Amino acid sequence: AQNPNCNIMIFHPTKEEFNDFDKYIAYMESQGAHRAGLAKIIPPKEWKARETYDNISEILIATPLQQVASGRAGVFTQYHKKKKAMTVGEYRHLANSKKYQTPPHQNFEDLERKYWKNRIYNSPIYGADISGSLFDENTKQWNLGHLGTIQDLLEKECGVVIEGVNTPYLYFGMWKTTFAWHTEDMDLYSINYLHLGEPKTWYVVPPEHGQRLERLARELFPGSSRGCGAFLRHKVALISPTVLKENGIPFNRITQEAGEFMVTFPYGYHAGFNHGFNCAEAINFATPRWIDYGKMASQCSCGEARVTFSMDAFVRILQPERYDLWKRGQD
Numbered sequence: 400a401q402n403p404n405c406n407i408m409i410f411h412p413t414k415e416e417f418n419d420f421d422k423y424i425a426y427m428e429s430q431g432a433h434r435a436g437l438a439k440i441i442p443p444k445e446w447k448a449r450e451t452y453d454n455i456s457e458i459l460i461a462t463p464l465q466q467v468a469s470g471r472a473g474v475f476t477q478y479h480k481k482k483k484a485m486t487v488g489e490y491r492h493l494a495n496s497k498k499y500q501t502p503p504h505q506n507f508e509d510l511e512r513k514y515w516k517n518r519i520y521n522s523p524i525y526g527a528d529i530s531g532s533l534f535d536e537n538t539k540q541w542n543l544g545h546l547g548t549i550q551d552l553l554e555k556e557c558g559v560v561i562e563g564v565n566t567p568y569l570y571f572g573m574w575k576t577t578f579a580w581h582t583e584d585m586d587l588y589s590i591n592y593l594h595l596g597e598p599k600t601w602y603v604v605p606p607e608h609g610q611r612l613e614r615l616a617r618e619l620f621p622g623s624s625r626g627c628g629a630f631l632r633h634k635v636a637l638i639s640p641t642v643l644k645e646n647g648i649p650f651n652r653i654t655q656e657a658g659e660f661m662v663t664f665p666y667g668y669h670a671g672f673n674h675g676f677n678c679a680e681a682i683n684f685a686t687p688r689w690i691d692y693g694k695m696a697s698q699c700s701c702g703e704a705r706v707t708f709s710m711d712a713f714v715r716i717l718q719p720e721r722y723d724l725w726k727r728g729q730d
């Protein structure tokens with residue numbers, strides 16, 4: 400078996416290899432990339448997402464989210480407090496202010512140490528799930544707004560036509576902004592492009608070991624576990640690399656820089672944080688290999704997770720028992 404230790408692999412496709420998205424994902428998997436739960440793809444030197452980022456300041460962040468922590472430094476939850484709307488220009492200025500700016504640091508490792516030591520004592524503001532794209536319409540390769548849709552994948556594989564659409568989301572981050580431990584809806588893939596700014600550090604558990612993370616989470620957040628059989632779907636729980644190591648949970652880490660893609664694979668739990676002001680774009684996608692994961696995906700039915708319009712058809716078709724039971728959380 401390829402990549403038996405489940406290491407995060409980094410790929411350098413040529414411009415020719417960058418033409419056929421599906422084919423390259425399949426190639427990455429032939430080399431065992433999916434075993435890690437996460438891969439990095441560095442685009443060919445000839446490629447660009449768009450010409451410049453000089454004209455993005457007028458984008459609106461309608462509902463910036465203040466990420467307030469509760470718990471201990473290495474085991475905490477965060478809740479999202481809604482703030483007043485601001486433009487990307489205003490958000491950038493806020494990110495760079497004395498209150499919110501990245502502290503002096505030696506390197507990525509020093510910054511990581513500072514993040515886990517001090518994250519809970521601050522409440523950074525994140526711009527999340529803003530529908531939109533920063534890819535130029537003329538960018539033909541790896542344009543996250545031009546991917547084949549999940550609905551079309553299901554139709555190609557299973558012969559059923561379903562309602563729903565599948566569009567990208569923008570994320571504007573600042574120092575300490577955090578993504579909690581999660582897999583994607585329906586255990587889909589995700590692809591994430593860091594358009595500009597400071598790095599994003601990622602942690603990932605191999606899909607073959609996801610249930611180990613779930614078991615630890617139940618132990619560390621016992622009240623949350625009693626409330627919902629899939630509470631990680633709420634996307635609020637953080638566990639540090641130190642705590643993962645202490646509990647023998649297999650995981651890896653990597654830092655994504657501007658101009659780089661990351662792909663998460665079905666049932667690859669991931670979490671992470673931003674180093675400073677940045678902008679990323681991400682979308683879910685599917686392949687034939689995803690279908691078996693989709694049919695087995697856990698679901699939140701306690702009402703906390705209540706997800707997109709397009710998720711309905713996925714549960715309805717792939718998980719009819721669970722759909723019937725839900726009808727008898729989203730509503």
Ligand SMILES: O=C1Nc2ccc(Cl)cc2C1=O
Pocket residue numbers: 698699700701702703704705706710711714715721722725728729730
């Ligand atoms: O939060 C939710 N849990 C669910 C489980 C099944 C279906 Cl069809 C929808 C949902 C939610 O919105």
Ligand SMILES: O=C(O)CNC(=O)C(=O)O
Pocket residue numbers: 570577578589590591663679681682
């Ligand atoms: O960048 C973020 O804040 C979160 N991104 C993801 O979880 C993803 O791309 O799958």
Ligand code: NI
Pocket residue numbers: 581582583589663669
């Ligand atoms: Ni994700």
Ligand SMILES: [Zn+2]
Pocket residue numbers: 626627628629630632633699700701702703704
């Ligand atoms: Zn729930």
